[PDB]
């Protein structure tokens, strides 16, 4: 289960670089130089890295310092063959963003947030990124009167529309991906789930430029089924990027390594991504726990990729097994894929077998055979076939 760059595994600089500061504790690890992270991740078999502006260029850097930070990073990419498929903006750490970036009540903060974002879009394009992520972690509220949500959505739309005008005007081949999260650090965050983000995109001026960047743990913070949400995003043609990690239920955002947390949900996710032919990066947004030293950081990162590869093997074996294919037919998955009424509305209305002469009791007595199917899936996941 050895990863290679062809597997398209990517990591944020802020993941392996997380120093371990949590709400109740100081950092347990020293800061990593981005150049070291690129080299170490390349040695593990990663394909690329991603960054927030402020991960790569310290906030407040002069133009000359900015140039030197980028030059050093580009040489590390050249030395390793690592790519940068995605970039994003930090609109959450600095105190100026305490009430949001794009939806801050203060208008001057909203304008600054847009300018900070635009500057990093230029850099992302320079480095070859194809997707630009926006996680609106400060967009929201702790109390009901603090934020008129209709006005906030107007401001959010305004911001994204302006960004779309900018990339179109410059001729950039980049697309945007909105990352939902239901809460934390705000009491409630705007666009809290994949569904809300997909709905919002349809009201933008150029919806084709925007998709979603769902994160395993974030949907699980609302108790939702992550594979189901991914299926809806794929169905809409909007899965532009994905963040892979683990989460143990409804609590603070844990960002565990992928495969930890809900293991069976991870299996069904990999099955879906591979079956659907998702071709984007397999990006890990995770935090090595603060109990770990640097050897544990790299072990945790390697484990992300290993677990994806094991699950990919098991899901492929499941789908290829003739006994599973028979069980899928026994459960009528084949019929689910056939149209209900390709004969059309009038034919349906005239079809006595659909109502007047339908034997509801005979249909009700048919078992779905779902438990046998699910036990075959369990056996395959555990390698007990």
Report the distance separating Cα 322 and Cα 358, nearest Å. Answer: 33
Report the distance separating Cα 279 and Cα 300, nearest Å. Answer: 24
> In this complex, which beta carbon is closest to Na ion, that of residue 161 or of residue 351?
161
User: Closest Cα to residue 213, out of 282, 161, 166?
Assistant: 282
255 lies in the binding site for Mg ion (CB under 5 A): yes
> In this complex, which beta carbon is closest to Mg ion, that of residue 139 or of residue 285?
285
Distance between start and end Cα atoms, the chain: 19
User: Closest Cα to residue 215, out of 27, 50, 29, 32?
Assistant: 50
Q: Which of 53, 54, 55, 262 is catalytic?
A: 55
Candidate segments 56-64, 245-253, 305-313, 370-378, binder of Mg ion by CB under 5 A: 245-253
53 binds, among Na ion, Mg ion, none (CB under 5 to 8 A by kind): none
Site string for Na ion, 142-181 (x = CB under 5 A): -------------------x--x-----------------
Torsion of CA 22, 25, 29, 31, to 10 degrees: 60
Q: Give Cα 80 distance to the centre of its chain.
A: 25
204 lies in the binding site for Na ion (CB under 5 A): yes
Contact of 81 with 39, CB cutoff 8 Å: no
φ/ψ of 344, rounded to 5, equals: 100, 170
Contact of 301 with 16, CB cutoff 8 Å: yes
Candidate segments 120-128, 249-257, 300-308, 371-379, binder of Mg ion by CB under 5 A: 249-257
Using CB under 5 A as the binding rule, the residues of this chain from 272 to 331 that contact Mg ion are 285
Q: How far is the CB of 175 from Na ion (least distance, A)?
A: 11
205 lies in the binding site for Na ion (CB under 5 A): yes
Q: Is 295 assigned to a binding site?
A: no
Q: Which of 52, 241, 283, 380 is catalytic?
A: 52
* Cis peptide bond upstream of 185, omega within 30: yes
Using CB under 5 A as the binding rule, the residues of this chain from 174 to 233 that contact Mg ion are 215, 217
Q: Is 202 assigned to a binding site?
A: no
Contacts of 47 by beta carbon, 8 Å cutoff, 6+ apart: 5, 6, 7, 8, 9, 10, 82, 83, 85, 281
233 binds, among Na ion, Mg ion, none (CB under 5 to 8 A by kind): none
Residue 47 falls in the annotated catalytic set: no
Q: What is the DSSP letter of 137?
A: T
Q: How many CB atoms lie within 10 A of CB 108?
A: 9
178 binds, among Na ion, Mg ion, none (CB under 5 to 8 A by kind): none
262 lies in the binding site for Mg ion (CB under 5 A): no
Tell me which residues are annotated as active site.
Answer: 52, 55
Binding site for Mg ion (CB under 5 A): 215, 217, 243, 253, 255, 285
Binding site for Na ion (CB under 5 A): 161, 164, 204-206
Residues of the binding site for Mg(2+): 179, 215, 218, 243, 253, 255, 285
């Amino acid at each position: 289960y050895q990863p290679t760059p062809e597997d398209r595994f990517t990591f944020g600089l802020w993941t392996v670089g997380w120093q371990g500061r949590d709400p109740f504790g100081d950092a347990t690890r020293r800061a990593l130089d981005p150049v070291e992270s690129v080299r170490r991740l390349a040695e593990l078999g990663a394909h690329g890295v991603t960054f927030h502006d402020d991960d790569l260029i310290p906030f407040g850097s002069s133009d000359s310092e900015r140039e030197e930070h980028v030059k050093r990073f580009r040489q590390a990419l050249d030395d390793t063959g690592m790519k940068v498929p995605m970039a994003t903006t930090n609109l959450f750490t600095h105190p100026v963003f305490k009430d949001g970036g794009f939806t801050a009540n203060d208008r001057d903060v909203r304008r600054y947030a847009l300018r900070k974002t635009i500057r990093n879009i230029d850099l992302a394009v320079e480095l070859g990124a194809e997707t630009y992520v926006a996680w609106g972690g400060r967009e929201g509220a702790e109390s009901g009167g603090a934020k008129d949500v209709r006005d906030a959505l107007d401001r959010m739309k305004e911001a994204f529309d302006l960004l779309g005008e900018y990339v179109t005007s410059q001729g950039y081949d980049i697309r945007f991906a909105i990352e939902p999260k239901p809460n934390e650090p705000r009491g409630d965050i705007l666009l809290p789930t994949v569904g809300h983000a997909l709905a919002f995109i349809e009201r933008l001026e150029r919806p084709e430029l925007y998709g979603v960047n769902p994160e395993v743990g974030h949907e699980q913070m609302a108790g939702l089924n992550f594979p189901h949400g991914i299926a809806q995003a794929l169905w809409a043609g909007k899965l532009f990027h994905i963040d892979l990690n683990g989460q143990n239920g409804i609590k603070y955002d844990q960002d565990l390594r992928f495969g930890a947390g809900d293991l069976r949900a991870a299996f069904w996710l990999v099955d879906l991504l591979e079956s659907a032919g998702y071709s984007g990066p397999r990006h890990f947004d995770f935090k090595p726990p603060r109990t770990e030293d640097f050897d544990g950081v790299w072990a945790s990162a390697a484990g992300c990729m290993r677990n994806y590869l094991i699950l990919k093997e098991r899901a492929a074996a499941f789908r290829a097994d003739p006994e599973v294919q028979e069980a899928l037919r026994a459960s009528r998955l084949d019929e689910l894929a056939r149209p209900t009424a390709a004969d059309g509305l009038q034919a349906l209305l005239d079809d006595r077998s659909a109502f007047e002469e339908f034997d509801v009791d005979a249909a009700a007595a048919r078992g779905m055979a779902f438990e046998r199917l699910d036990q075959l899936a369990m056996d395959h996941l555990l390698g007990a076939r």
